[PDB]
């Protein structure tokens, strides 16, 4: 709700004070990364 305005019941965070007493919004979780890594093998090496 914005005081002294023509619209109330606003939705979504304002662009003025998006933090309001917090610096980092810590988010802990598990990530799985199945990627196409560029690497041939333990091959591509002199045999000796």
């Amino acid at each position: 709700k914005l005081t002294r305005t023509r619209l109330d019941r606003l939705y979504g965070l304002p662009a003025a004070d998006p933090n309001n007493g917090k610096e980092y919004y810590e988010i802990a979780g598990r990530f799985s990364l199945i990627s196409l890594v560029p690497s041939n093998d333990d091959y591509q090496t002199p045999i000796a």
């Binding site: 333990d42 091959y43 045999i47 000796a48």
Partner: protein, 268 residues
């Protein structure tokens, strides 16, 4: 008397020359479940008494499954007769079990973490026993390097088994082989086939006889100690076994390594 020295034995042909046993049986548990009775052992003991062998000394043991019987068999007895169920999908299990229980194997431990290995005779076979055996092997030429598999890695090996309860393996003579097996559950031993064992005979309770006892594909003979009969009910099988007990005793004999005189010959 003198032991451990092979000496000539004198003989003749004009001199006129021409019990206390201990029987044991191994059978799978499905027979016991099907017979629906538990007092049958007393009947078998009485029938053995009728033929002539004393009671009290006869022991019976059961195994949950042919795989359960496969891992570390125990054979301390005088006349071993084992009933092995036949199948059309598990030929190698029966073959390896009969081969292991039919011939004596002088074995040594194998450490595949600090050594290499090679064969030097036609009786050199590798026996793996455990709960989860997966033998992974990469051949090495005379220059000690991998062919078709890199020695540095181990996943690229050419496997010969996968979670097998027991697996007998043979390798090409004259070359080294680097091995990597999960030793935390399964053991690999280097055994040499010294000679035949008559103390154990196997009766294939089933159909098409498929047993081979020789590692070379050239010869696959049918030994006399390998018996085979048809079956629908286990009581018929037991009746046939007890009726022909004399033939089974005649074809078999006392173990050729515990005669109380063959000492210092790898037994007693």
């Amino acid at each position: 008397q003198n032991y451990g020295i092979n000496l000539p034995i004198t003989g003749s042909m004009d001199i006129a020359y021409a019990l206390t046993s201990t029987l044991c049986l191994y059978y799978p548990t499905e027979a016991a479940t099907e017979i629906n009775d538990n007092s049958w052992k007393d009947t078998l003991s009485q029938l053995f008494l009728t033929k002539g062998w004393p009671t009290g000394s006869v022991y019976f043991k059961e195994y949950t499954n042919i795989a359960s019987f496969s891992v570390d068999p125990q054979l301390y007895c005088d006349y071993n007769v084992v009933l092995m169920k036949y199948d059309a999908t598990l030929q190698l299990d029966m073959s390896e079990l009969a081969d292991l229980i039919l011939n004596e194997w002088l074995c040594n431990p194998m450490d595949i973490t600090l050594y290499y290995y090679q064969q030097t005779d036609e009786a050199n076979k590798w026996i793996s026993m455990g709960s989860s055996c997966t033998i992974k092997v990469c051949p090495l030429n005379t220059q000690t390097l991998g062919i078709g598999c890199l020695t540095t890695d181990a996943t690229t090996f050419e496997e010969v088994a996968t979670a097998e309860k027991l697996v007998i393996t043979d390798v090409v003579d004259g070359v080294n082989h680097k091995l990597d097996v999960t030793t935390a559950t399964c053991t690999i031993r280097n055994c040499k086939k010294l000679g035949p064992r008559e103390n154990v005979a196997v009766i294939q309770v089933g159909g098409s006889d498929i047993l081979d006892i020789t590692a070379d594909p050239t010869t696959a003979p049918q030994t006399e100690r390998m018996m085979r009969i048809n079956w629908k009910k286990w009581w018929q099988v037991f009746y046939t076994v007890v009726d022909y007990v004399d033939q089974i005793i005649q074809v078999m004999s006392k173990r050729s390594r515990s005669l109380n005189s063959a000492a210092f010959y790898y037994r007693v």
